[PDB]
Amino acid sequence: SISSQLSQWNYNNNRVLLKRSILKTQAFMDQLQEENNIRPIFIAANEKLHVLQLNIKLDGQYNTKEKNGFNIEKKALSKLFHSQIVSVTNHLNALKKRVDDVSSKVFITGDVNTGKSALCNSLLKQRLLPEDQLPCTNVFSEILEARENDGIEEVHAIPLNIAPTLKEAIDMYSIQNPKTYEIHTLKELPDLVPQNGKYALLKIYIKDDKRPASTSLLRNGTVDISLIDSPGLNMDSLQTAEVMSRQEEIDLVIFVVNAENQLTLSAKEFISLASREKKLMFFVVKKFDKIRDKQRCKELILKQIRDLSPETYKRAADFVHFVSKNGYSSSDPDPDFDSLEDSLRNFVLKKRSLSKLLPAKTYLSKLLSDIIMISKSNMKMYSETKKELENKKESNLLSIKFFQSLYEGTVAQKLMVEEINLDID
Amino acid sequence: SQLSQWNYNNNRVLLKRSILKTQAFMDQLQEENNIRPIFIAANDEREKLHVLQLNIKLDGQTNIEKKALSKLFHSQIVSVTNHLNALKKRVDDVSSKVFITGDVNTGKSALCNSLLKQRLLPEDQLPCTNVFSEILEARENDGIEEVHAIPLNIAPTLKEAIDMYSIQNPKTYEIHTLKELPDLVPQNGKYALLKIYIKDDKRPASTSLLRNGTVDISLIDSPGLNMDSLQTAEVMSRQEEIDLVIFVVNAENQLTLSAKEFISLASREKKLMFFVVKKFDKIRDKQRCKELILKQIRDLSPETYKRAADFVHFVSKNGDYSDPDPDFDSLEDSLRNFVLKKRSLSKLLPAKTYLSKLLSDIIMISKSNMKMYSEESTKKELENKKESNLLSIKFFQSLYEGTVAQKLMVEEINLD
Numbered sequence A: 001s002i003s004s005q006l007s008q009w010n011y012n013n014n015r016v017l018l019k020r021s022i023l024k025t026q027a028f029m030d031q032l033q034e035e036n037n038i039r040p041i042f043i044a045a046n047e048k049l050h051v052l053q054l055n056i057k058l059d060g061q062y063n064t065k066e067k068n069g070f071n072i073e074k075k076a077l078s079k080l081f082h083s084q085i086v087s088v089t090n091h092l093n094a095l096k097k098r099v100d101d102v103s104s105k106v107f108i109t110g111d112v113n114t115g116k117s118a119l120c121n122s123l124l125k126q127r128l129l130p131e132d133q134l135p136c137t138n139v140f141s142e143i144l145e146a147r148e149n150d151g152i153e154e155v156h157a158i159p160l161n162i163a164p165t166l167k168e169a170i171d172m173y174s175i176q177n178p179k180t181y182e183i184h185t186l187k188e189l190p191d192l193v194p195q196n197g198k199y200a201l202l203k204i205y206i207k208d209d210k211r212p213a214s215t216s217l218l219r220n221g222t223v224d225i226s227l228i229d230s231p232g233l234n235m236d237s238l239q240t241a242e243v244m245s246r247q248e249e250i251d252l253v254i255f256v257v258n259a260e261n262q263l264t265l266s267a268k269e270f271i272s273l274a275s276r277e278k279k280l281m282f283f284v285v286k287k288f289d290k291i292r293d294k295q296r297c298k299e300l301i302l303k304q305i306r307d308l309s310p311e312t313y314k315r316a317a318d319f320v321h322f323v324s325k326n327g328y329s330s331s332d333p334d335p336d337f338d339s340l341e342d343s344l345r346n347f348v349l350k351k352r353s354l355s356k357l358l359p360a361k362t363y364l365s366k367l368l369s370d371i372i373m374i375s376k377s378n379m380k381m382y383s384e385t386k387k388e389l390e391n392k393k394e395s396n397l398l399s400i401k402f403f404q405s406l407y408e409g410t411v412a413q414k415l416m417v418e419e420i421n422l423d424i425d
Numbered sequence B: 001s002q003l004s005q006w007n008y009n010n011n012r013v014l015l016k017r018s019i020l021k022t023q024a025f026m027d028q029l030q031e032e033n034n035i036r037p038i039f040i041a042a043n044d045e046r047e048k049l050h051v052l053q054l055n056i057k058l059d060g061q062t063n064i065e066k067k068a069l070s071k072l073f074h075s076q077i078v079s080v081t082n083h084l085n086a087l088k089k090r091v092d093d094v095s096s097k098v099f100i101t102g103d104v105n106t107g108k109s110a111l112c113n114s115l116l117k118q119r120l121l122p123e124d125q126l127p128c129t130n131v132f133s134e135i136l137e138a139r140e141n142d143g144i145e146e147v148h149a150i151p152l153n154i155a156p157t158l159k160e161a162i163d164m165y166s167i168q169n170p171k172t173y174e175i176h177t178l179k180e181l182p183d184l185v186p187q188n189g190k191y192a193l194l195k196i197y198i199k200d201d202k203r204p205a206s207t208s209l210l211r212n213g214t215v216d217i218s219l220i221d222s223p224g225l226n227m228d229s230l231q232t233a234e235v236m237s238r239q240e241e242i243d244l245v246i247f248v249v250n251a252e253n254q255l256t257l258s259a260k261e262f263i264s265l266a267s268r269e270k271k272l273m274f275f276v277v278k279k280f281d282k283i284r285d286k287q288r289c290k291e292l293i294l295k296q297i298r299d300l301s302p303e304t305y306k307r308a309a310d311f312v313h314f315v316s317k318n319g320d321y322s323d324p325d326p327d328f329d330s331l332e333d334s335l336r337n338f339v340l341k342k343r344s345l346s347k348l349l350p351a352k353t354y355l356s357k358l359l360s361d362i363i364m365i366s367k368s369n370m371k372m373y374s375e376e377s378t379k380k381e382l383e384n385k386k387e388s389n390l391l392s393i394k395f396f397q398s399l400y401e402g403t404v405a406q407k408l409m410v411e412e413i414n415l416d
């Protein structure tokens, strides 16, 4: 208890440190946007940024080995860069809201038909979420404890018509404000989960009465936990975008891998984007019982995880798992699943600083790195009609002082962020 | 049948001329866009375009002015120009290249082995085919059954490496036997394409597909979609260089997003393609899985849907003929009908469909650019800017009259 009390003490301290770091990194962000507005900055270069990358893609156009670049002039690129500034600011606010929150939101996502719904059902030891051979979950399914809903086991279907976008409709939901959700029982879930054109979020309130609290995930007595079953990747273009959007508003990712396909391209597109903030995530490989070349399949998944996120591969004993339990509490042990359940429980409940706060430090360190790289480039370059020349030389000097100060500030802030130690437990 | 082939050769010559005329229209637009940018719309809006649609996406992330948009659209011109080149090569070729592609682990290689009734191409549960494996009749290689492996280092990129290939030029390929095939197919970082010469003597010519005696056929086993970003890109590019598509669908997933991205792009020219639903024996809800796939076919290509009996097939034939299969026999019969008998539909129609689509887009671009300049800063700038407007208006007047006339030329090519 003394170690658990030191962890809670350390966690609340680091929570305060990262909240201030987000505040000041956002202020460096705000300085960039204000500077880019008055005189455009330099984005071109001939290595790459982590978060502030400006990558232009033509829809329906695939470059096999083409130059890209497109040779857009400076002023047009900076107007597109402003969208990258807004995107990072929204992500920064998503991290700040998560840091202030004390609850841990777990995200179980992956390609279509990998077994995410079956894995969530396994975590609760009850067949609650619909599972099907054909594409099933089309609406985000969030399982919560029944305490918040006064102890009634029912489903709150968040309608999509209450807000212009999905994110705004989810944020609108409050149990005290009816008609922002429709009351449904637990038994219409097969009818609710495919209606992606009607509902944005399914608030599923249940009681984790099955299995005692010492080894139950939702009823741990320590941390409020939220379980979110995600629609499949590689199905719809908008569906993928919505899954991308959720990743920024959840604390923990459990990525479900189909053993035959290994990490697919649609899967790599998610993990690499999540890696902007999430140094560590869970990789659960289902349907491994089918594989007959297990050793070669073994090495192929790990080799891909090593590249997509080497910290997870470094800690593969706790984060890489190969389960076969499919569509509970049977007389059979199933040690593969129990080992994931213990590793998961240990991560969410004992290592708060690692499970909850590490995404903030990783993103801050990466975002500050980019602002350092951007300042360095604009410095070297700004160092390099007649009537219009006098004001162009004056404006160039007015921003070389800006990028000099912004350079100095972010080099300092990066070193300050590294002073935070989240691997205490 | 003697008369029927005379109309085929005439249309092959008629399409060849329209391709050369549209190729020149493309060059003129690219030349004009370089000296003075053109007016284009980014989103769909109304009166949308078929092939020259310009949709912008910032990679990694539920604005832009005239100059910058035209630089973006220039790369779309060269893609259409390169696509027009690949079509011109196809109308030149009297053979039919059949492309068997789809998502990873759908059964692309297994379907090729079934069409040849021979366990030739490697099959594996885990991702296997990474190099384009194309199968020819051994009569083109002096009757020698071997593998010609085209190295990738012989040319800067992959496309030029295949066109470099010549059986008479040595070391532009590497001689390999058929048994080593499991070792060459995963080396996408070393080889660009595998030339596989076999003899289709396992079944008589009346039922064989490669040795039919009527039409030269080439069977191409494709790397799986949704694996690598570059690997998917080369699959996009190979589509433009083949005459027929056999899309292999994974039954439990139906048409994935990566699948829809192939088909929708191939729909720009190919109104008809084959859909083989493999692993259908494992499906529990066969009726609902059938309906799901068919509905997706209807939206992705209605022409294939109205002929679903000839193009949409559900086969349980798998890897793991050392007994005939009725569901699979219906696939080969309909396939043989498409490549051998209905040559004008399977070989010439793609060229015509692209031309009618592209020419329709030039007309709209020319018409819209035309009226838009007709609406309207130092004194030196204005006088030069005015003359450039007059120069671009006169250009699009010529391009409008040229492509409207070429539109009628293409629509009067009667295939049936």
Ligand SMILES: Nc1nc2c(ncn2[C@@H]2O[C@H](COP(=O)(O)OP(=O)(O)OP(=O)(O)O)[C@@H](O)[C@H]2O)c(=O)[nH]1
Binding pocket: A111, A112, A113, A114, A115, A116, A117, A118, A119, A130, A131, A132, A133, A134, A135, A136, A137, A138, A230, A231, A232, A285, A286, A287, A288, A289, A290, A323, A324, A325, A326, A327
């Ligand atoms: N052999 C085996 N079958 C599995 C496993 N996990 C799921 N399945 C089966 O594969 C199918 C997929 O079940 P789901 O729970 O719905 O997986 P999903 O990721 O949620 O699929 P979608 O929601 O539609 O995107 C089900 O029929 C399961 O019975 C597994 O670990 N091993």
Ligand SMILES: Nc1nc2c(ncn2[C@@H]2O[C@H](COP(=O)(O)OP(=O)(O)OP(=O)(O)O)[C@@H](O)[C@H]2O)c(=O)[nH]1
Binding pocket: B103, B104, B105, B106, B107, B108, B109, B110, B111, B122, B123, B124, B125, B126, B127, B128, B129, B130, B222, B223, B224, B278, B279, B280, B281, B282, B315, B316, B317, B318, B319, B320
């Ligand atoms: N049940 C069933 N299994 C199949 C079927 N076709 C192939 N398989 C099996 O699924 C696996 C796929 O093998 P492949 O022939 O290489 O399929 P593929 O499309 O070429 O996969 P890649 O080349 O790696 O992209 C093999 O182990 C086959 O035995 C089928 O129609 N039904």
Ligand SMILES: [Mg+2]
Binding pocket: A116, A117, A118, A130, A136, A137, A229, A230, A231
């Ligand atoms: Mg699901």
Ligand SMILES: [Mg+2]
Binding pocket: B107, B108, B109, B110, B128, B129, B221, B222, B223, B224
């Ligand atoms: Mg294959």
Ligand code: NA
Binding pocket: A113, A131, A132, A133, A134, A135, A136, A137
């Ligand atoms: Na499913």
Ligand code: NA
Binding pocket: B104, B105, B123, B124, B125, B126, B127, B128, B129
């Ligand atoms: Na395979």
